[PDB]
């Protein structure tokens, strides 16, 4: 239910310490009009998702708050804009009367905003899955395609205004998020993002290093199988034949060394502006990982178990927004990996181990890979 039921205990957290526009309805079971506008409020919460949050406060069970604002009779509607009464309305009113009161008081013009958080990587970590799942939140709009702005000198030269006009439209209250997995490893990107928005928030979703490398390789092989071209076995690319050790020049191994790349980014951004998503837990138990991202982005908790249903035939979780809109990810997500010689997997696990430890230390998240 899109409506938020308040208590006197949780009014500071949910309205005053909150951000965005919130309409609070003060009501009680003995107020006829209050029960006559309850259906209207239900339709408003749905037609104004994005630009307004509708909340109720039952003054019978919560007698503390209403006096603090001069609430004489009920119903009384208080529109808060970022913990500050911006408007009031007293006594019942029609759905069209409420729409006139809101529309003439909400800054709800559709706008193209620069992203306030960027998923900077990693390739095959679950970037698409992370983006689509965060979009489940009513405050988040996703950039549908990968934009590739800071990692492409042709695009970067077109100005930050070009980047902005690539973004989707949104109510100014929402936040926009973009995904471009190449940003993580491209050298010039951290300083360019920093110039744009030195306080931007950066998301990194990682998987088990060896597994991410094989997933990487598998994507390249599909695109080569399709074109009827020859490639090589993962074992031949990942192991140097002269030493039988890990070949550090292989791009898919280089990209799983998450800590060498992160340290380039820490030259410019503090660790407090990063959040690391456990891409493995996103595959098997995603909801807790999404709740951490909600708090990282200073968003209220709106993603629930209802929004994630497991698809047994697919082997992955799928998304459910409302009662009728359902979505699984594209066909290229969830490829079966080739079987890889166990000895090589052991050599890679032993190879990544010290880099994993350094990664846990810097980020403060221990992901329990080998």
Ligand X SMILES: Nc1ncnc2c1ncn2[C@@H]1O[C@H](COP(=O)(O)O)[C@@H](OP(=O)(O)O)[C@H]1O
Binder of ligand X out of 262, 329, 348, 367 (CB under 6 A): 329
Check: CB of residue 124 under 8 Å from CB of residue 207: yes
Complex with ligand X: residue 123 or 201, whichever CB lies closer? 123
Is 328 considered catalytic here? no
Which residues sit opposite 81 in a β-bridge? 21
Minimum CB distance to ligand X, residue 206 (Å): 10
- Of residues 15, 71, 78, 129, which one binds ligand X by CB under 6 A? 129
For residue 318, indicate whether it is catalytic: no
Q: Which stretch binds ligand X (CB under 6 A): 16-24, 33-41, 124-132, 184-192?
A: 124-132
Closest contact distance (angstroms) between CB of 182 and ligand X is 11
Catalytic entry in 34, 244, 318, 328: 34
Q: Which of 81, 302, 335, 349 binds ligand X (CB under 6 A)?
A: 335
> By the 8 A CB rule, do 128 and 329 touch?
yes
Q: Tell me the two tokens of residue 318.
A: 């799928």
In the complex, least distance from residue 164 CB atom to ligand X, rounded to whole angstroms: 24
Question: Judged by CB under 6 A, which stretch of 17-25, 160-168, 326-334, 359-367 contacts ligand X?
Answer: 326-334
Hey, which residues between 283 and 322 contact ligand X (CB under 6 A)? Answer: 283, 316-317
Mark the binding-site residues, compressed into ranges: 124-128, 146-152, 179-182, 207, 215, 250-251, 317, 333-337
Do the strands 308-311 and 316-320 form a parallel or antiparallel pair, or are they unpaired? antiparallel
| Binding annotation for 3'-phosphoadenylyl sulfate | 124-128, 207, 215, 317, 333-337
Task: Give residues with Cβ within 8 angstroms of 182, minimum separation 6.
Answer: 121, 123, 148, 151
By CB under 6 A, name the one of 282, 293, 297, 344 that touches ligand X: 282
* Residue 369 to residue 209: CA distance in whole angstroms: 8
* DSSP β-ladder status, 169-170 and 111-112: antiparallel
As measured in angstroms, the least distance from the Cβ of 212 to ligand X is 8
User: How many chain residues interact with ligand X (CB under 6 A)?
Assistant: 17
Breaks in the chain after residues, C-to-N cutoff 2.5 Å: none
Query: Judged by CB under 6 A, which of 20, 75, 115, 125 binds ligand X?
Result: 125
Give the separation between CA 334 and CA 215, rounded to whole angstroms.
Answer: 9
Q: Whole-number minimum distance, CB 299 to ligand X, in Å?
A: 20
Dihedral (Cα; 233, 234, 237, 239), 10-degree rounding: -110
Query: Least separation, in Å, of the C-beta of 255 and ligand X?
Result: 11
Cβ-based nearer residue to ligand X, 111 or 283:
283
Could you say which residues in the range 201-220 bind ligand X, by CB under 6 A?
Answer: 215
Q: Find the binding residues for ligand X in span 152-191 (CB under 6 A).
A: 181
Q: What are phi and psi of 273, to 5 degrees?
A: -95, 5
Pick out residues in 24-53 that bind ligand X (CB under 6 A): none
Residue closer to ligand X (CB basis): 54 or 252: 252
Is 44 or 120 the residue whose CB approaches ligand X more closely? 120
How far apart, in whole angstroms, are the C-alpha atoms of residue 120 and residue 181? 5
65 versus 256: smaller Cβ distance to ligand X: 256
Stretch that binds ligand X, among 5-13, 74-82, 122-130, 339-347 (CB under 6 A): 122-130
Cβ at position 287, least distance to ligand X in Å: 12
Catalytic residues: 31, 34
Q: Which residues bind ligand X (CB under 6 A)?
A: 123-129, 181, 215, 282-283, 316-317, 329, 333-335
């Amino acid at each position: 239910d899109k409506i938020i039921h308040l208590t006197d205990d949780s009014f500071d957290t949910d309205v005053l310490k909150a951000d965005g526009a919130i309409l609070v309805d003060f009501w009680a079971e003995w107020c006829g009009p209050c029960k006559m506008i309850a259906p209207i409020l239900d339709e408003i919460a749905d037609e104004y998702q994005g630009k307004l949050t509708v909340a109720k406060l039952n003054i019978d069970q919560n007698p503390g708050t209403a006096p603090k604002y001069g609430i004489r009779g009920i119903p009384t509607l208080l529109l808060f804009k970022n913990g500050e009464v911006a408007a009031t309305k007293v006594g019942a009113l029609s759905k069209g009367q409420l729409k006139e009161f809101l529309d003439a008081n909400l800054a709800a013009a559709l706008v193209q905003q620069l992203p306030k958080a960027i998923i900077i990587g990693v390739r095959k970590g679950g970037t698409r899955a992370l983006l689509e799942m965060l979009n489940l939140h009513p405050a988040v709009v996703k950039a549908s395609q990968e934009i590739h702005f800071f990692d492409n000198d042709e695009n970067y030269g077109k100005g930050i205004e070009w980047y902005r006009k690539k973004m989707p439209f949104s109510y100014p209250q929402q936040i926009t998020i973009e995904k471009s997995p190449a940003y993580f490893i491209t050298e010039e990107v951290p300083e360019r993002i920093y110039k744009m928005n030195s306080s931007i928030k950066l998301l990194i979703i990682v998987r088990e290093p060896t597994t991410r490398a094989i997933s990487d390789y598998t994507q390249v092989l599909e695109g080569k199988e399709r074109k009827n071209k020859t490639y090589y076995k993962f074992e031949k690319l990942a192991i140097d034949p002269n030493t039988c050790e890990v070949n550090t020049k292989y791009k898919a191994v280089r990209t799983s060394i998450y800590t060498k790349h992160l340290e380039r980014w820490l030259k410019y951004f503090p660790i407090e502006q990063f959040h690391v998503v456990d891409g493995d837990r996103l595959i098997t138990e995603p909801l807790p990982e999404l709740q951490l991202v909600e708090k990282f982005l200073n968003l209220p908790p709106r993603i629930s178990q209802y929004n994630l249903y497991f698809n047994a035939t697919r082997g992955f979780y799928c998304l459910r927004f409302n009662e009728i809109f359902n979505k699984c990810l594209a066909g290229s997500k969830g490829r079966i990996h080739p079987e890889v010689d166990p000895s090589v997997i052991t050599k890679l696990r032993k190879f990544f181990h010290p880099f994993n430890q350094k990664f846990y230390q810097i980020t403060g998240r221990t992901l329990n890979w080998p």
